[PDB]
Design a protein around this nucleic acid. Structure first.
Lengths: 262, 180, 124
RNA sequence: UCUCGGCCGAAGCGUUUACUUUGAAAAAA
RNA sequence: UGGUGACUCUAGAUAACCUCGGGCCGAUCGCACGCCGGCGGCGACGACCCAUUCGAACGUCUGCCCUAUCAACUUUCGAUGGUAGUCGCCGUGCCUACCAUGGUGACCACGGGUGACGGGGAAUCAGGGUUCGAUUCCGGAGAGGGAGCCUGAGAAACGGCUACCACAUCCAAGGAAGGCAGCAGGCGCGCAAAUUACCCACUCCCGACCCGGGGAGGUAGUGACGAAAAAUAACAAUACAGGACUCUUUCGAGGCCCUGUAAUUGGAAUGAGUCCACUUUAAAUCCUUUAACGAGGAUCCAUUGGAGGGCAAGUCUGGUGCCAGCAGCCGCGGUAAUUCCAGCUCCAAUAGCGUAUAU
RNA sequence: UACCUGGUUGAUCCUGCCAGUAGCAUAUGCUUGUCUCAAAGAUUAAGCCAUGCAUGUCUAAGUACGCACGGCCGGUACAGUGAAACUGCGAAUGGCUCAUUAAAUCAGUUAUGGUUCCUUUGGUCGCUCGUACUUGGAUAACUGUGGUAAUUCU
């Protein structure tokens, strides 16, 4: 191929989009943006497939071009705009806010948040560097550069960002015992307390996490996102609290619900 | 590139030996008792039972306290119980291999229509089903191979529009009465 | 009487100035209910006017029991003309498509490609 | 753990592979 | 200052340079308007530079078919390495100059062949395996065959250009224009494969764009590639034989006992079909739904193979007479042929079945 | 379902292959009522192509002096739609095909601390000590004259 590619085949689309096969040949090729192609939800998928506010891409385009959608406090009219982890979607016309938080199955669950929590987000800093007359700069997962960060912030820490101003209001250090959530791999969507971090120089450091119920798992360092200090998350969590249920437990819960169903 | 799907699966297998007296006699006996159109229906039910048995053997080769064995075996047993093929108490993977094609041919809509006092004969049952005289719960079922579930057994009425259940005279009766 | 309407799913959808729903119509012994009849029954049911009611995609289940489709109730006819597909408006008579086929348009465009300036306006 | 060790206060290869078991990472169809 | 496992990293300070082929530091556009000349809110567009996204390009480790009637290969015209440079977006024999003589090989190098694009995968399969993968997803490559370029962020682009080769089109003979391995369609090749249809309504993509375009795609047409479901009848009373808890001398009867040439007799049931109205959908169609008509030889008429064995089903009848033919194999046919040609009968699958070939 | 059967002999037991047997994929013959899904010029010729279409694009926000229309009425800087043209962007995506191609492509793995990166997103953008109440020249479109048998030539 010459130059970039602009299409995304439907089967080649990320599985967590929960797209079906017979609707079309193509999937919404996410626009370039703060989040990677495979770790993002396009605005069209969220507005049509998840919220059912629209039936086609035409109605999604109408909704977006009426300027009703604000991702991280700013209006976006791109139907394929990539909204990613921790992004805050605000629809003031319907007066509702969502935070893109991974389901325990690895999918962006529709998670409604209160308007007060909609004013801030959490960002994991990706890199820190001194530049241009000694000003410290910090780059997070949302690809936003913040100058003059707190000197106590390091890589893999997670800052709290005020969406209106874009400034850091607090931060959490990457330390053992802090709450964390997995943003990639097999354990994607799981929430637990960091227990230890085995370092492999020249390679990927492995972080061990322990579930609230006591199920221990492991992940790479790049797939860990610190969520709160201790066992107190700084954000609201989905209906599942990050606990992965084994298929036996899922079946048992579903059968118990059917026993008391109406 | 097309939005179409191509996953299509053949539902039967032809026997290895085409002309053996024992197999031919048994297949024709099954067709006779259950009023099936041809041999492919027997082969289809045999393929269904064979796939079920293969799954049961696979699961039985695993450890008793194996999460995959437990989950898949419970799913298979519940499925076989729900269609009434297995007894409610015979819920072990060993009782799967003890099943026969009779247990599956007994659950067809043809057999259930014939055995619920809805049809005079099993061929009458097939002719009734294929002519939209039979309904299950609320849906007018028309396919005689419909494998009715256990909770679906108690609701097999005679439709609400069929001459036998809905009271509207059919074409023949209407034409005959209109000249009398 | 013999034809009933019940809207299973229902959302207020303030974003497109409409309420959308799935219509289940019960017509136990009749043909598929015409869209106009479903529209007027919906208008009576939701205390509005029939001109802002847009129904589509009515599939009748096997055996003749019920038909299932989709319906929209716009807040006004202006919002209806603003947020509806052109063909759904053309069903109500509120839109008129072009009177030329794709072949004519494509051939005219490719003929225009061969001329320059205002002469492009003088092609067939 | 060896610079001894955060309610009595940490060894978790401080001589190697195969093998075996585990974990991570690994498109969809 | 900060960071990495690790820098000749980032940042800071010096002493200078700064390509007319500057390299940045806005002479741009819309909307709404408010204070004492000025001050301003919300945007759009643009511009270095750093991140980010989308990638691209290059390297690492491990893994591809058959061939020795291919055993030595590379090293003149870079072959392996080192030094310096050139070029390049950068690492690099990528290319030079100088130096060293290296590098690969039975653990199969090198050469040849491939009806070889690779993979995810497909068929078959007890456990192993064998074979296939042009083909809708990923990666690669190409646009008749080579080569060279322009623009741009990205192309060695071909629905861009330049040239040569092979074809080919128009010409007033001076010149000019080409590239369907895009969608249709045509010729040719062959055993072998569909419409010169409708639409951007869906899925997405592109653009200055809520508005335009898209043979990408969708929808129809041809379609026994293949796969799923599935009609071609069901019931009853009768002439008949058949069958049974009973006694009987063979009947009676068994009809919530059951078979059949029954082209008997009946009423029921119904969809194949033709027409309606919807429904479907950009218009259509097709299903689905509602009507009207529509079955007794229910003529609304099921076929393809076979009947010696293997292997299911006739050494019945007529004809032929080692002929014509059947026969995958064994064999049949030479004047009573179970085997050919036909009639009848049967049986295997059944809207499917036979044959050829590959596996 | 982890299977065999016929054929060398006067007869037997073997080795052994031939033939049978069941899928599968192409072709082909006969036949064909319903309905759903669905492949389809790959194999030989990456052979040759008539014709038509397949890539274009404007918002309130680059340039409006085409009366082509046209207003609240006028001696009105530009009312407003607005073809054309200049400008910007895209045309390097998609689609097709499998001829090349044998550690080459490709797959898993890892690296770029050895590079480039339109676009999106965030940051930076009076950090420079030396007509601005806005500079200049064109060129389209438009008018007008032409050449050529001939073209999206000019």
């Amino acid at each position: 191929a010459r130059g970039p590619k602009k299409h995304l085949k439907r089967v080649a689309a990320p599985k967590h989009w929960m797209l079906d096969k017979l609707t079309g040949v193509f999937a919404p090729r996410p626009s370039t943006g703060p989040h990677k192609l495979r770790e993002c939800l396009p605005l069209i998928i969220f507005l049509r497939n998840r919220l059912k506010y629209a039936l086609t891409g035409d109605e999604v385009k109408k909704i977006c071009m009426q300027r009703f959608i604000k991702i991280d406090g700013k209006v976006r009219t791109d139907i394929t705009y990539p909204a990613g982890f921790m992004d805050v979607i605000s629809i003031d016309k319907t007066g509702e806010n969502f935070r893109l938080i991974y389901d325990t199955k690895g999918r962006f669950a529709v998670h409604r948040i209160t308007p007060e929590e909609a004013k801030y987000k959490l960002c994991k800093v990706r890199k820190i560097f001194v530049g241009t007359k000694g000003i410290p700069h910090l780059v997070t997962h949302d690809a936003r550069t913040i100058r003059y960060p707190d000197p106590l912030i390091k890589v893999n820490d997670t800052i709290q960002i005020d969406l209106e101003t874009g400034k850091i209001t607090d931060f959490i250090k990457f330390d053992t015992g802090n709450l964390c959530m997995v943003t990639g791999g097999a354990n994607l969507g799981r929430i637990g307390v960091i227990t230890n971090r085995e370092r492999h120089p020249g390679s990927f450091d492995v972080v061990h996490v322990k579930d609230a119920n006591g199920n221990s798992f492991a992940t790479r360092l790049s797939n860990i996102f610190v969520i709160g200090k201790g066992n107190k998350p700084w954000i609201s969590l989905p209906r599942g609290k990050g606990i992965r249920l084994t298929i036996a437990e899922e079946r048992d819960k579903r059968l118990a619900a059917k026993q008391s169903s109406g | 590139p097309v939005a179409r799907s191509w996953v299509c699966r053949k539902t039967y297998v032809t026997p290895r030996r085409p002309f053996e007296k024992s197999r031919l006699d048994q297949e024709l006996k099954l067709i006779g008792e259950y009023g099936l159109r041809n041999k492919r229906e027997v082969w289809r039910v045999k393929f269904t039972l064979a796939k079920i048995r293969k799954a049961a053997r696979e699961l039985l080769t695993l450890d008793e306290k194996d999460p995959r064995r437990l989950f898949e075996g419970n799913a298979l047993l519940r499925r076989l119980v729900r269609i009434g093929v297995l007894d409610e108490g015979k819920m072990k993977l060993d009782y799967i291999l003890g099943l026969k094609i009779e247990d599956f041919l007994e659950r067809r809509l043809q057999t259930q229509v014939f055995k619920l006092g809805l049809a005079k004969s099993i061929h009458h049952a097939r002719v009734l089903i294929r002519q939209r005289h039979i309904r299950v719960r609320k849906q007018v079922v028309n396919i005689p191979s419909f494998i009715v579930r256990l909770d679906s057994q108690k609701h097999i009425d005679f439709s609400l529009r069929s001459p036998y259940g809905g009271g509207r005279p059919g074409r023949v009766k209407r034409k005959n009465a209109k000249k009398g | 009487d013999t034809v009933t309407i019940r809207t299973r799913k229902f959302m207020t959808n303030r974003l497109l100035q409409r309420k959308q729903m799935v219509i289940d119509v019960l017509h136990p012994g009749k043909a598929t209910v015409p869209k106009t009849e479903i529209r007027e029954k919906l208008a009576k049911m939701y205390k509005t006017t029939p001109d802002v009611i847009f129904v589509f995609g009515f599939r009748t289940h096997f055996g003749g029991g019920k038909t299932t489709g989709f319906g929209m109730i716009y807040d006004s006819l202006d919002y209806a003309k603003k947020n509806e597909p052109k063909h759904r408006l053309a069903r109500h008579g509120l839109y008129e498509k072009k009177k030329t086929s794709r072949k004519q348009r494509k051939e005219r465009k490719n003929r225009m490609k061969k001329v320059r300036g205002t002469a492009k306006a003088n092609v067939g």
